[PDB]
Amino acid sequence: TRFTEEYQLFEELGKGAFSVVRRCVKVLAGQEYAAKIINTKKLSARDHQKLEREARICRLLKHPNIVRLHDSISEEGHHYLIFDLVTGGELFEDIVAREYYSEADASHCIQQILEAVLHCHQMGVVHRNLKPENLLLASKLKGAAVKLADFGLAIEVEGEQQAWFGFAGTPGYLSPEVLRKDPYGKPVDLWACGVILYILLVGYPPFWDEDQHRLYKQIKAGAYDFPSPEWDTVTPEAKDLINKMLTINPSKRITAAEALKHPWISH
């Protein structure tokens, strides 16, 4: 079929459990891409489901701050997902290397995530697994764009309707409503932005225990803090935005629209 006839593979970029990602070129276009090549043979039932979902959901979204799916091909034992080429690695790896971000950069970064999140919510998509691992830098350049990735756990919603979509996501970034087993929707992604923003500024996360069942109580109680002295030189409008994102009640939590209009980002 048409991967062989349309595209040419080049170097290894990353390895998965059942997937490899390799730089490729749509030949008659001469445009380069990231081909995630997935051994469909090795995949389980729920793994297959997530792949179909990931392909349909990604294809709904077209935003500079979202890793675009351009194509989707199948070959008996392999599915090929043709994505944006991205050379800058994960935001996680960039936070460790740089340890924390200035308020300025932190603002410029969370800005792009929020716009991407806004597009998702405007397209009736909720990511559910927002974390620095799933936020990628376009290139090694010192102003490279941030793009949202891995929609394997993303879901479709009808307007502002909440429903029990299941327990899913990463413990550090799970919203209180998910953990309470309440119906949920768009606001979970804005909770995840709170935790990501908090990490950008001081370089460590607001919710952690070695004991997972205590971690989940810490999240549900809204039990985060701004310890002295490191937070004493952070601005109250930075903390204000965060407090609005880490609101326990999704109903009272700030939306992506509202957060983009926050002075800390607006100005």
Partner: peptide, 12 residues
């Protein structure tokens, strides 16, 4: 302070 670590996704 709390440590920042790579964390894995639940799917259930």
């Amino acid at each position: 302070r709390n440590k920042l670590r790579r964390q894995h996704d639940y799917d259930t």
